[PDB]
Design a protein around this ligand. Structure first.
Ligand SMILES: [Zn+2]
Ligand SMILES: [Zn+2]
Ligand SMILES: [Zn+2]
Ligand SMILES: [Zn+2]
Lengths: 297, 298, 296, 289
């Protein structure tokens, strides 16, 4: 069986026909900053091109979205006036296929589970540390979406009550402590000049004591948050991706692993694995979402 | 379809035939002190008695137990003498001639509140019980989340305060170690410099003792925070809170807890938080539902 | 017995002749951007001008500044160059009079102690919440220097292990939690756009939940850090100054006071007073630093 | 110049004549468990015996005692100890808190001898301290000065005997160690058993002990920002008699929390059990002078 995956990012759209194991085509175009109708047009035409290049029509479309979904309306809750856009209904009109929405982090989690670092497991938990912190939970490989589409909001577990303000409206969230933007927040504040993650990591590798303190602290919060999530979910394996975590200095991964292990004393520790699928994970998980929906429907 | 539920406690064994919605019988007997073999006989006998009293035989048995379970091996890995690493499942199956399905007592109460109690009508729910310890259970459509290794839904051991007080699990700052019955008694006894149990602590609270208020309200807020945090992971239909320590706490406790839960869901859709409805029978009901849904699902 | 007070700030320089109770003159001039040489010159110039304007000469000079300072050597270790300037010696050669150096936050503390909110006390604790958080300890009533001149660095007590990184090299310091720039750091992060303290306070007053959460948190950390310092010092009174604290929305002062009171349950709470001396405290304290040095 | 020092403890009373250099006599009598006026007799008794065994009279008496004190009244419970003892003995009396007195002793005679200022922390059953600035105890406006055990290190932390939570004492004192160990091991565990488990490599015991050690290091490093003392002195049987990993973890935390700062030396207390008596004596001796 064949489907089409779409990954709607903030900068680019990716599309590809997927046969259950592999992408038979891959199309990347920029994401329209011109509004909803044009976003939808570019999605439909990326799908069409992907199908043309694979020489194969998809029987369904999986759409990965860089926002939280309303699966009932079929709407997305840096892309102009996508908000409240009836993206599912529109794409289903244009395309004549069912459209299955998924959150981008849940999609990447689904991809690693079936095709990446957790292949072989029945359940897995995925965290991505990038600009923000997101993740997903796969339980017998389907995404846990929640009653309201808020399931798997792993960057917003509270790790430090009385901690730094979070974008979500709370404080001391994992994202507020350890995301790329939190790292830049704290670096810029502590060094009293704009410091981006690149500069922070440069400083870290040169042995700057302030940079070390800050980076290691963030690494340990991730390890703590993952160990804590093990008590909730007890996943076969834990997968960590996202460019901020994967490209971090080696001291980072060491500290994170160390904290995870310390916060599993007295417990059975799942293996913690690096994400394998890189930038294609969202596209693969969007396609898998459609694929598995068809398969189980 | 009929099954038999069994709830194995430190003091008492409960048993009853269950029809998918209601108990058809209810038998309560003391839990033996004489070790695993006698406990296993008491369980089988209580089962048979429940079946005689209901006039019906169950086709499976569900058994709820406090301990850490090995679901793999069907063994109980506390207040019950040399049930240690005891292979209850096979022994019970052999005695009874029925398949036996094991479940942790907190997971069992959670299943029961989901199907028969505070969360009836939901697809998913999340249950926390505050008693001597803190436990819980996660129900997603209509079945307990057990985890790859049976550690799923260990809701009392999420880390809420790094550098907090030592927990019995081997960590520190766990919800249990902050807010359980024994945690309150630990901190009240230290701070008052004399033995203070939860009864004396709650009297002091109701009398307006400043130190008692401080300690109780802080524990109430950690429960609110831990439940709000769990909503981000699970996004359950409803959150259910039970256990004797939370349910019988002063009214200021419940207010402070609810206020913390609402504050830690600013920016979020807050599931309803509801008092557990089933009381002392939740464990028996969930043990029965365990077997019922397995047989139904089988 | 007269002295001259000098307050060296980044934008302006204040000078004034001080008789022990009162300023007999007050001069404000801009702070030169040309480098140490000219700064020292402008300082000496404002000194004489104030002496003329008051119609009397001081037998000593007090100089207050925000720099990291070396008190034994009289060197300033936001003004253009300046790195390790021997201001004390240079001012002494150029002036005739002995020169005494004080940290600006210490000076403001001394002034509030002798002339301000803590007048009448033998000991007080002073905290100033501005862009950063500074402090001063007055026992009675002389500034606690410290053996290394690190005494009274009240913005750097650790309140939250594992908290936000501080400019000092630590984390979870009072300053890192509650200073103006820490407010701007968290507001800018959480709102995902540049938010300065003016905008944060505007949002706070319009009832924005995120702004309320963040500002009240910073308020409570101030109340906690002050209550905690009480255990160490048992000051006659605690004095809170700085425009970020004194000019914050109604709601902020009330949360801060409540946290202070909550963290002194079971204790005798010193009064927590609002600084009285405003923009002149640094000048008055520089004057008092010289005044009290002379008279002992 | 010669004074008498007295160290009123729970179990026992210590007394000794002091000449500004050393003790010339030392008596240890049990404290009257029953009656407050009998304790007052026993203090003058022990003072006389001390002066008998020394063969010298003291010009002043210094009295160290565990409770928080009222230095205007001269009372502790709420008993006119200063006035009585002045009447009963015929010498001026000077009161001091026990931990302050130990701080003063370590400053003039022990680990910090030679400093202008020092900071002392005693980790025992509770956590107490004293601040010494040149050469005298910081008493505070209300006699509450130097209550170092009650600095807030962990908001939302464990309830404290003082009425707060997350105080250094509530995190790291002897009773705090026994509180957490007894809870986590689910059986009575005193500091001896806890330290035995630590040395045996029990993971739970290591976690709990190292945490308390680090909190002491952070609290001392934080007090350095307020006081900038010449040296920091750590004593008490719980700190002094702890396993070696305890001291290393503490120092490491103290050091990490003074990154970017000049760290004062941290020194072990030298005077052991005589600190209190020696500091009571110094309290009298220094007040005379
Ligand atoms: Zn958040
Ligand atoms: Zn635990
Ligand atoms: Zn700092
Ligand atoms: Zn305390």
């Amino acid at each position: 069986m064949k489907v089409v995956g779409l990954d709607l990012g903030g900068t680019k759209i990716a599309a590809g026909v997927f046969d259950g194991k592999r992408l038979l085509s891959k199309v990347v175009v920029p994401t329209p900053k011109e509004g909803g109708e044009r976003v939808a047009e570019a999605l439909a035409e990326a799908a069409e091109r992907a199908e043309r290049e694979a020489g194969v029509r998809g029987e369904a479309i999986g759409l990965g979205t860089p926002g939280p979904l309303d699966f009932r309306r079929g709407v997305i809750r840096n892309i102009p006036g996508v908000q409240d856009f009836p993206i599912r209904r529109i794409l289903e009109e244009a395309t004549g296929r069912p459209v299955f929405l998924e959150n981008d982090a849940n999609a990447a989690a689904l991809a690693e589970h079936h095709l990446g670092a957790a292949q072989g497991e029945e359940s897995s938990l995925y965290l991505t540390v990038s600009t923000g912190i997101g993740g997903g939970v796969v339980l017998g490989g389907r995404v846990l979406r929640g009653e309201r589409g808020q399931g798997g909001e792993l960057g917003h577990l509270t790790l430090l009550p009385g901690g730094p303000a979070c974008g979500c409206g709370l404080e001391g969230c994992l994202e507020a402590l350890a995301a790329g933007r939190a790292l830049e927040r704290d670096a810029t504040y502590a060094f009293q000049r704009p410091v981006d993650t690149r500069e922070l990591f440069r400083l870290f590798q040169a042995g700057d004591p302030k940079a070390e303190r800050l980076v290691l602290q963030a690494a340990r919060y991730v390890g703590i948050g993952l160990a804590s999530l093990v008590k909730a979910f007890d996943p076969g394996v834990v997968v960590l991706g996202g460019g901020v975590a994967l490209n971090a200095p080696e001291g980072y991964w060491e500290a994170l692993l160390e904290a995870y292990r310390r916060y599993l004393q007295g417990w059975e520790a799942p293996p913690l694995r690096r994400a394998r699928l890189g930038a294609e994970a969202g596209l693969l998980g969007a396609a898998l979402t459609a694929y598995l929906e068809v398969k189980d429907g």
